A paper describes a structure:
Tailoring steps catalyzed by SAM methyltransferase-like proteins have yielded particular insight into evolution of anthracyclines and generation of structural diversity. [name] is a canonical S-adenosyl-L-methionine (SAM)-dependent methyltransferase that catalyzes 4-O-methylation in daunorubicin biosynthesis.
Similarly, [name] [name] is adept at carrying out diverse reactions with improved acceptance of 6. The structure of [name] [name] with 2 shows that the sugar-binding regions R2 and R3 no longer interact with one another, since the presence of the L-rhodosamine unit of 2 has driven R3 away from the aglycone core of the substrate. The displaced amino acids in R3 remain without a defined secondary structure, which will likely provide a higher degree of freedom for the substrate to re-arrange its position.
Residue numbers in the entry:
A (entry chain A): 14 to 162, 166 to 288, 293 to 354
B (entry chain B): 15 to 354
Write the structure that this text describes.
Amino acid sequence: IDALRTLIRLGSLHTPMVVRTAATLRLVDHILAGARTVKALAARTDTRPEALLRLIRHLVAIGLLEEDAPGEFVPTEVGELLADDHPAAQRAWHDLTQAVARADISFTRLPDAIRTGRPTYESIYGKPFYEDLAGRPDLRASFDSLMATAVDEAPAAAYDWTNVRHVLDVGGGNGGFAAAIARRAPHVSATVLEMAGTVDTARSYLKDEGLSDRVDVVEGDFFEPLPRKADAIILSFVLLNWPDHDAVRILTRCAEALEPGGRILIHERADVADRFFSTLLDLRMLVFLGGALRTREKWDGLAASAGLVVEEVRGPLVSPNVPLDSSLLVLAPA
Amino acid sequence: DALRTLIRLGSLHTPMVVRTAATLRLVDHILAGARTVKALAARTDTRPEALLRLIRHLVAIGLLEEDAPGEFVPTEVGELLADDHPAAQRAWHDLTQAVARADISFTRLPDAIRTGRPTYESIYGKPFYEDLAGRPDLRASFDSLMATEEEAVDEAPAAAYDWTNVRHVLDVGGGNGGFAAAIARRAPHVSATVLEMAGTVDTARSYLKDEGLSDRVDVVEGDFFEPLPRKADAIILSFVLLNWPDHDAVRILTRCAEALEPGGRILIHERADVEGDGADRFFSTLLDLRMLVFLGGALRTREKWDGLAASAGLVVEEVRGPLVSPNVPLDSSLLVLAPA
Ligand SMILES: CC[C@@]1(O)C[C@H](O[C@H]2C[C@H](N(C)C)[C@H](O)[C@H](C)O2)c2c(cc3c(c2O)C(=O)c2c(O)cccc2C3=O)[C@H]1C(=O)OC
Ligand SMILES: CC[C@@]1(O)C[C@H](O[C@H]2C[C@H](N(C)C)[C@H](O)[C@H](C)O2)c2c(cc3c(c2O)C(=O)c2c(O)cccc2C3=O)[C@H]1C(=O)OC
Ligand SMILES: Nc1ncnc2c1ncn2[C@@H]1O[C@H](CSCC[C@H](N)C(=O)O)[C@@H](O)[C@H]1O
Ligand SMILES: Nc1ncnc2c1ncn2[C@@H]1O[C@H](CSCC[C@H](N)C(=O)O)[C@@H](O)[C@H]1O
């Protein structure tokens, strides 16, 4: 009977949907904003009081809410992470109208991705992942914000920027990694290569950090010739989005733009308790994009195809509000 | 710790990993000789690299273990996904069978919370039982999941009632007729009738025939919202009323009260809603929220049961008991109802 309870709990689809539904309704923020009754809570969220209580009941049973006084539910320690100002952003990561939780519906067709090795995102939303964001500015922004989370300081501190002149952050996102280098290395100029939409939140984030004279942004496709050369080329959580043959192409473009003596830095999670979140990231890449997490041995193959060699891998990098450690692989020409 | 706990709780990928393993019959294929991923992928027609990434999550959640290098075997928990296991959890997690198919309705849980209305129809085009009425594979699958393959999970509610003075039993919505069978084996003088829908009446007929009981239990096709096909002294409603919103349950109960013989009783076999700080609350809200998104139904408290009965001109005499069943993680009760 212990085994039965364990399997039912593990296989249950209603619990993560309860968490996600609570996040989308901003339930915890409404509690913290003074909604002390279910009546108040249903009004602020425009839901049915009878139905909202049945959701609160599961939220209590899984330890996200507690009933303090009768009919008064407040967040627990774990439940407070759904507050919108919490620096782990777990509410937005669970908001069904934001990009990742909406992407997560691709897991409902996991059998197909396991049969074919292809992502299931397109069969649900009409377009592959990044094409879908390209037509949905709310999701583009939303995804950009999730990706962005001060938090990339560990990778930057794991590399000596003494002899680095120009840094190119390929698929750099909102430019936080580039910013973390500029703060660390006062002599480097940096450039972010990013897609439409993103380049403007990158430009605004870089401006508001006071660094728009240290880091420019260029709109482009990193499968095409890169806009310029550099001594350090940054691929922070990019290649895991791509099958082997597309990652080779990206790496090849980086190699063609690498200055003499330069290095390509890959900031990712090497495939090896932590296994729970490793496999969650890895299967996400399967069903969203057709990508994957890769072992060190697999990394040697990809670099070899690109005419590169894995020079070194700098050990586990810990970050705030992040349950998975990171690595920095340094690549050189073959 | 807090961050890791919320992510585990909120993750969609773990239950879909379990459901994918059950749908591929992964555990059965290991149990049947597939010792390598290669042989596993071929038996399931899956990609070896992709099947391994799924296996890796099944190990992380403790459903498989790496015995020898590259050889994965089920754990004691993982063995519950074997097809002959009497709790039938593989079928319950099979995406092509009725309930795991219906669970997709949870992806629209907000709508159900906003409106109090089930979301099954918006995904599949038809209300739950109308969808089964067009899908013989699903109708059959659902009827087998309610039945359990165990002849004796109905014994506790059946042993909680004295069938001494009972002449005819009407099992309204009695599914495959196991509850009716459990009475006839405890009560040799009793005759029973199962009222069920098209398709199900035939699996109840063949189940009762193979139990040797077709001359003690008959089966009638019908709509329990219409006048019932005959009168009776015990009218059984086992796990039916939770499928229906209040107004429909009152209509069902009213039809039951109209068919009740003098001195007879309507028996309700369900889970009585009760506040709890216990581990069983997880499975209580699972059943209750399934009823919301599948059907618009609900689990009900005793207080709520009192109100339903009075609308139907009935009164709850006694609630007979949190009868605990062997190897079932949810408590059932038997409410005894008589006319007001
Ligand atoms: C929850 C852990 C992590 O935040 C690690 C990892 O997130 C880490 C690093 C990430 N990064 C910007 C440094 C950020 O600091 C975040 C708060 O923590 C991660 C995550 C998820 C994604 C991604 C992740 O990188 C993606 O990159 C990604 C992508 O590039 C394209 C589509 C989807 C995704 C992701 O879903 C997360 C993950 O591994 O979930 C299993
Ligand atoms: C796992 C516990 C239980 O089996 C209790 C409960 O199942 C109990 C009693 C049930 N019954 C036929 C006696 C059978 O013995 C089963 C193995 O155990 C239950 C369950 C599920 C359903 C239902 C359940 O009754 C339904 O009735 C149901 C329905 O009538 C129409 C659509 C869907 C469902 C259900 O999904 C289960 C439940 O509560 O899951 C949370
Ligand atoms: N063809 C393309 N050209 C340039 N950038 C691309 C691209 N396809 C995807 N990307 C970018 O790759 C990024 C990966 S996710 C964000 C990564 C960021 N460096 C970080 O570590 O936080 C996305 O921002 C996406 O816009
Ligand atoms: N209008 C209707 N008339 C008769 N039966 C109905 C019905 N609508 C739903 N049902 C039946 O109600 C049952 C609900 S589940 C049946 C549970 C079963 N008696 C048991 O305890 O094991 C299904 O078998 C379904 O066929």
